[PDB]
Design an enzyme around this catalytic site. Structure first.
Site, PDB file in Angstrom:
ATOM      1  N   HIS A  41      -2.630  -3.636   0.000  1.00  0.00           N
ATOM      2  CA  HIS A  41      -2.721  -2.433   1.210  1.00  0.00           C
ATOM      3  C   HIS A  41      -4.201  -2.546   1.832  1.00  0.00           C
ATOM      4  O   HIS A  41      -4.364  -1.762   2.796  1.00  0.00           O
ATOM      5  CB  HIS A  41      -2.187  -1.300   0.504  1.00  0.00           C
ATOM      6  CG  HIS A  41      -3.181  -0.439  -0.414  1.00  0.00           C
ATOM      7  ND1 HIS A  41      -3.033  -0.546  -1.789  1.00  0.00           N
ATOM      8  CD2 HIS A  41      -4.380   0.257  -0.096  1.00  0.00           C
ATOM      9  CE1 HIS A  41      -3.718   0.083  -2.509  1.00  0.00           C
ATOM     10  NE2 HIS A  41      -4.835   0.696  -1.577  1.00  0.00           N
ATOM     11  N   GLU A  72       1.438  -6.338  -5.262  1.00  0.00           N
ATOM     12  CA  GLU A  72       0.184  -5.412  -4.875  1.00  0.00           C
ATOM     13  C   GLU A  72      -1.050  -6.037  -4.961  1.00  0.00           C
ATOM     14  O   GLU A  72      -2.191  -5.480  -4.928  1.00  0.00           O
ATOM     15  CB  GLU A  72       0.276  -4.138  -5.528  1.00  0.00           C
ATOM     16  CG  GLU A  72      -0.554  -3.016  -4.512  1.00  0.00           C
ATOM     17  CD  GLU A  72      -0.057  -2.931  -2.877  1.00  0.00           C
ATOM     18  OE1 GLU A  72       1.040  -3.129  -2.524  1.00  0.00           O
ATOM     19  OE2 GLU A  72      -1.212  -2.485  -2.454  1.00  0.00           O
ATOM     20  N   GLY A 146     -10.395   6.619  -3.156  1.00  0.00           N
ATOM     21  CA  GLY A 146     -11.775   5.920  -3.224  1.00  0.00           C
ATOM     22  C   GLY A 146     -11.794   5.216  -4.696  1.00  0.00           C
ATOM     23  O   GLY A 146     -12.466   4.019  -4.772  1.00  0.00           O
ATOM     24  N   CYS A 148      -9.092   2.778  -5.348  1.00  0.00           N
ATOM     25  CA  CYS A 148      -8.247   1.386  -5.324  1.00  0.00           C
ATOM     26  C   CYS A 148      -9.178   0.186  -5.509  1.00  0.00           C
ATOM     27  O   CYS A 148     -10.195   0.348  -4.619  1.00  0.00           O
ATOM     28  CB  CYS A 148      -7.467   1.430  -4.180  1.00  0.00           C
ATOM     29  SG  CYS A 148      -6.119   2.747  -4.212  1.00  0.00           S
TER      30      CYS A 148
END
Ligand SMILES: CCS(=O)(=O)N1CCC(C(=O)O)CC1
Length: 182
Positions: A41, A72, A146, A148
Site C-alpha cells: 500500500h 501485502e 505511522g 506501517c
C-alpha cells in the site's frame, strides 16, 4: 530494556531506512545487497526517497501467493551506493506463531520507537482495507497510523512487517526466507 529489545535495536540500527512515497513515510527493512521490503500500500513507483535522498527504483515486485492472493509485501531493489548487512539467516523458513515479539518503527513522526506486542498468532486470512490478504500475523496491541513498515522481531528472528490494525489488534505480513533466494 531486555534481550528482545536488544535484537530489535541491532536490526533497526543497521537494516532500516526511512522510505518516502506519495502515500507517506514508512519504516523500510533492508534485507541484503540493495534489496528492501515495504508494505504494498506504499505504492512504490520509479523514484522513492531513502533518508530524504532521491533514489531510482531498479525493480519493485508486489508479492502474491500461488492462489494469486495479496501478501501485502513489495520487494524493492534500490539504486543505492551502499549494501545492507545480509540478515536473511534471521528469516523464518515456515509460517508459525511466536511469543514475546517487539514492533520497531523509525520515522520523522516516530523515531527510535519500540513496542512489546507480546504473543503473535498465525492469523492467516485478513480482509485488509477491503483486499483479501494471506500469511497475516496478529498481535493484541492498539497500533496507529505511522507504524506501517515497522519491523516485527523475536530474539534471533525477523518475522514480519506491520501492514495494518483495527484499533485493538495489529497485523503484520510474514517474511519468509524463500522470498529472498537468488
Ligand atoms: C540477546 C542477544 S540478541 O538476540 O539480542 N542478538 C543476537 C545477535 C544479534 C545480531 O547478530 O545482530 C543482535 C543481538
Amino acid at each position: 530494556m531486555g534481550p528482545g529489545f536488544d535484537f530489535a535495536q541491532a536490526i533497526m540500527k543497521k537494516n532500516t531506512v526511512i522510505a518516502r512515497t506519495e502515500k507517506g513515510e514508512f519504516t523500510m527493512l533492508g534485507v541484503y545487497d540493495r534489496v528492501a521490503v515495504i508494505p504494498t500500500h506504499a505504492s512504490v513507483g520509479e523514484i522513492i526517497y531513502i533518508n530524504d535522498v532521491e533514489t531510482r527504483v531498479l525493480d519493485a515486485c508486489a508479492l502474491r501467493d500461488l492462489t494469486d492472493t495479496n501478501l501485502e509485501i513489495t520487494i524493492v531493489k534500490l539504486d543505492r551506493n551502499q549494501k545492507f548487512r545480509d540478515i536473511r539467516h534471521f528469516l523464518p523458513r515456515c509460517e508459525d506463531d511466536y511469543n514475546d515479539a517487539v514492533l520497531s518503527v523509525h520515522t520523522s513522526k516516530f523515531p527510535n520507537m519500540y513496542i512489546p506486542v507480546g504473543q503473535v498468532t498465525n492469523y492467516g486470512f485478513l480482509n485488509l482495507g477491503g483486499t483479501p490478504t494471506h500469511r497475516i500475523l496478529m498481535y493484541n496491541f492498539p497500533t496507529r497510523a505511522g507504524q506501517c513498515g515497522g519491523v516485527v522481531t523475536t530474539t534471533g528472528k525477523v518475522i514480519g512487517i506491520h501492514v495494518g490494525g483495527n484499533g485493538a489488534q495489529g497485523f503484520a505480513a510474514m517474511l519468509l526466507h524463500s522470498y529472498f533466494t537468488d
